[PDB]
Design a protein around this ligand. Structure first.
Ligand SMILES: C[N+](C)(C)CCC[PH](=O)O
Ligand SMILES: C[N+](C)(C)CCC[PH](=O)O
Ligand SMILES: O=C(O)CNC(=O)C(=O)O
Ligand SMILES: O=C(O)CNC(=O)C(=O)O
Ligand SMILES: NCCCCCCN
Ligand SMILES: NCCCCCCN
Ligand SMILES: [Zn+2]
Ligand SMILES: [Zn+2]
Ligand SMILES: [Zn+2]
Ligand SMILES: [Zn+2]
Lengths: 385, 385
């Protein structure tokens, strides 16, 4: 009744097609969009699922010359005699009503978000299950998207596990620190991470204009002298900051901060960027946090009078993150892997003691959100069908 | 005289340090920024060139307790007895005056831009020279940044050349189409590019939220039946559109368009994104164009009344690109490689004839701008020193 055509007609100087569906609802389709989206073999390359039609061939003032319909299809003639057929269900899905458009966006982009603080129950799956079963990998990625973190247990205590997960997703995101990298204490460390010191809450790689979307950390070796992990839900913390201190929020969501990274690892590098620490979209929603205190540059490109208030705002933000209501702490054991949203969470680590042998060793890697969301879409189709 | 300290003193309740330089100019440095940027081994990890100091250790209302200076350094005591030394030239570089800040940003980010139309003289270097000499690679990357395109001549007519350039930069940007990819006519093409058809002006991969910054195309085999290249300076064309048709500019710079790519290549994929075709920064400057007509989705997430005006605006934009004043056309020969800014230029190709043997073959790859700018910074230092 909802996908069955009761009537189709050309309206508004034939610039619009209206479908009355068998449930009595009406949908409206611009003529120019119909022509633009003709599925015929001239207009559309089926093997690529791509449009061949050029903008140059599209008359933007086009109207429907003629139209007939049955219950499942519309058949349209255009003024230059081009001919097009459209399927009812194809049309229904792409209905321009707000409700239809929003429904479809949800299906494409999986916007459901669960904010958390110290009450978090760390979502936890089995490593091998996720590698072997689509039902488990689907749970893994959908929970990663929704909650921002998933722990996988039961990996080996050897290198190569994050690469298996990289492959399960598709491929890992190569950076100057390599395809994967070893978090351990290193002589002449090229990064604070490769010492025994504490890492305060941070996101990884704000020195890049496109920071890693997803980070993977596999515990190979753990120390009893410290090295606990801590995480915080940056989107939750931003929400609290906007409420508690709107001026601080405004400063952090409007001030461009310089980040830097210079050294040698996978190859030699000298990286520079600018980001707002709180990055809003065009509707004012926080979409990414970009903050690492280690790699924030000495160079600070703001007028002198904005400097101290920036620092005062950053301090408020960090105090909220550290609050016992926001923070979630846990300790990784050999064989655990955490995978999290590096655009949303901030993460850190407690200090531990140095010594002559390596007492602590993680293997890390990054992935891109477009790569993960692709895999998520494919898994959903496989598991639902 | 400009980098030599004549006087240094604490002002404004000791919250500010003022340096009077020997040229009589004065610079001002907030106390909190000085403390934040203490270079001592407690505060700063020299092997990483990174800050160890935590936001949590920083008192945002800090003032200078004491200060002495000589011509080359300031020596500061803080209220908790921490102690810091700062070098004069280090201070001068990071001066908070607008002129000093702008000068340094230019040095970091190479903002110089040369807009062009059909008068372009295609910058051209020798392939092997660029691989062998820093002076040539430096010219290559700086011209790529400034002009948006450089042709390299004298490569071989075999696969593997774009990878050599990838290595010269650092590393290539892996996508679902592989590390490198072959542009040629293919049975069951997964992409319009892999047919003999015409490609209208487009940027590559707007289906990704982070499209490739730089694209490399190496002509292995060329056809005499067509296959000419065309390029346009998207930043130049956007400037003309804003002047000629502000309403069209506004629509394209504010309307989110859905892009899609589904299929199998390096692995199986189902990619979706949203972009404004003209992407402005926070000051209203165009920073990226995101437009491929083949991969623009059938799904169009706007109210029905915005649809036809969007198409009318897109048409104006494409007509400007096609204008004989904007367009630059040329033909690649075996052994040529073009490298261009895929955020700024749009590119295309004339149709050619199909047949039973492959008459036309390019090898392509992508790179990230942060990777290229890193290499550019390193090369400049090597060539200037
Ligand atoms: C060195 N690793 C652990 C890869 C982190 C790099 C990103 P950070 O923001 O310096
Ligand atoms: C298939 N290549 C040539 C790699 C282009 C992919 C990006 P396009 O926007 O579809
Ligand atoms: O070592 C840890 O527990 C966490 N490591 C990091 O956050 C890192 O390397 O970026
Ligand atoms: O084939 C050409 O000349 C140009 N190719 C492309 O623009 C492409 O593959 O994206
Ligand atoms: N069943 C309708 C078929 C319409 C074909 C018309 C071709 N011009
Ligand atoms: N030449 C000045 C050295 C100052 C050292 C002071 C240590 N508190
Ligand atoms: Zn058609
Ligand atoms: Zn980290
Ligand atoms: Zn110090
Ligand atoms: Zn292209």
């Amino acid at each position: 009744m909802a996908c069955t055509i009761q009537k189709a007609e050309a309206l508004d100087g034939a610039h619009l097609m209206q479908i009355l569906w068998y449930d009595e609802e009406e949908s409206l389709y611009p003529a120019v969009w119909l022509r633009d989206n003709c599925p015929c073999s001239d207009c559309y390359l089926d093997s690529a699922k791509a449009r061949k039609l050029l903008v140059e061939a599209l008359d933007v003032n086009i109207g429907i010359k003629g139209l007939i319909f049955d219950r499942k299809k519309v058949y349209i003639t255009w003024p230059d005699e081009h001919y097009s057929e459209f399927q009812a269900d194809w049309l229904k899905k792409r209905c321009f009503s707000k409700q239809a458009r929003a429904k479809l966006q949800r299906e494409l982009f999986f916007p459901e978000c669960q904010y958390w603080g110290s009450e978090l129950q760390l979502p936890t799956l089995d490593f091998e299950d996720v590698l072997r079963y689509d039902e488990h990998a689907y749970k893994w990625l959908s929970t990663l998207k929704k909650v921002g973190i998933v722990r996988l247990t039961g990996a080996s205590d050897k290198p190569g596990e994050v690469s298996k997960l990289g492959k399960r997703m598709g491929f890992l995101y190569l950076t100057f620190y390599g395809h994967t990298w070893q978090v351990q204490d290193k002589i002449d460390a090229n990064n604070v991470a490769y010492t025994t010191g504490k890492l305060s809450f941070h996101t990884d790689y704000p020195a890049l204009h496109h920071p890693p979307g997803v980070q993977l950390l596999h515990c190979i070796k753990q120390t009893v002298t410290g090295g606990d992990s801590e995480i915080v839900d940056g989107f939750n913390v931003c929400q609290k900051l906007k409420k508690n201190n709107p001026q601080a929020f405004q400063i952090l969501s409007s001030t461009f901060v310089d980040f830097t990274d210079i050294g040698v690892d996978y190859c030699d590098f000298s990286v520079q960027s600018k980001h707002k620490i709180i990055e809003l979209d065009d509707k004012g929603q926080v979409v990414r946090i970009n903050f690492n205190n280690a790699t924030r540059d000495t160079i600070f490109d703001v007028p002198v009078e904005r400097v101290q208030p920036f620092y005062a705002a950053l301090k408020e933000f960090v105090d909220l993150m550290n609050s016992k209501e926001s923070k979630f702490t846990f300790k990784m054991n050999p064989g655990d892997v955490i995978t999290f949203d590096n655009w949303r969470l901030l993460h850190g680590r407690r200090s531990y003691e140095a010594g002559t042998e390596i007492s602590r060793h993680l293997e890390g890697a990054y992935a891109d959100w477009d790569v993960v969301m692709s895999r998520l879409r494919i898994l959903r189709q496989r598991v639902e069908n």
